[PDB]
């Protein structure tokens, strides 16, 4: 499948491509502000994510940090990233079906727009701001605004026991952006494509 990375940020931002045990693709490359990044994922991945990471540093090996989204320091992302990260998370070619969805279960640290590119289905989007209107609690210095089981990791927050509620804190993700996971056991806002279905993610959609 193919995707499509655009970063209409102002800023630049360090596109993450994984599947938490290796590369989707290269696995990370930088996207200046308008730039797009085109991806390969292979049919049948499952639980690939998508991110931006944010003020990166990389050495000429590809060695260094991002303020959001770090993924172990690599350029080349073979890890899932460092909250706070907005996450536009795909499995593919599951009977049949593509599942696509954006979390806010991890943070926000970039607005992100998720669509196809394809026929069959609709896309799903979190624009608001939320790091602006980010609780004080969850404010994450280096940008951002951490979810609540990075900051308080407590068995509510994190649904450790696979019981657990919304919380004043999911209900503030899930205001500012109604269509994305807030925490584990949300009402789920996946949305079923086609199999084999291609995307586009871009970040920053509104502004």
Do not use: H
Not at 34 to 41: A, D, L
Not at 75 to 80: A, D, H
Not at 114 to 127: K, L, M, N, Q, W
Request: overall charge positive; hydrophobic content about 30%.
């Amino acid at each position: 499948a193919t995707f499509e990375i655009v970063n209409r940020c102002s800023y630049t931002v360090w596109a993450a491509a994984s599947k938490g045990d290796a590369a989707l693709d290269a696995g990370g490359r930088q996207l200046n502000s308008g730039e797009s990044w085109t991806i390969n994922v292979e049919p049948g991945t499952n639980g690939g994510k998508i991110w931006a990471r944010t003020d990166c540093y990389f050495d000429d090996s590809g060695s260094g940090i991002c303020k959001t989204g770090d993924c172990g320091g690599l350029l080349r992302c073979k890890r899932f990233g460092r909250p706070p990260t907005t996450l536009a998370e795909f499995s593919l070619n599951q009977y049949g079906k593509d599942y696509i969805d954006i979390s806010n279960i991890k943070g926000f640290n970039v607005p992100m727009n998720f669509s196809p590119t394809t026929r069959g289905c609709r896309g799903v989007r979190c624009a608001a701001d939320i790091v602006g209107q980010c609780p004080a609690k969850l404010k994450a210095p280096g940008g951002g605004c951490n979810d609540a089981c990075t900051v308080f990791q407590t068995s509510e927050y994190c649904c450790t026991t696979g019981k657990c509620g919304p919380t004043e804190y999911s209900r503030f993700f899930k205001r500012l952006c109604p269509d994305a996971f807030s925490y584990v056991l949300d009402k789920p806002t996946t949305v079923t494509c086609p199999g084999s279905s291609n995307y586009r993610v871009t970040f920053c959609p509104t502004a």
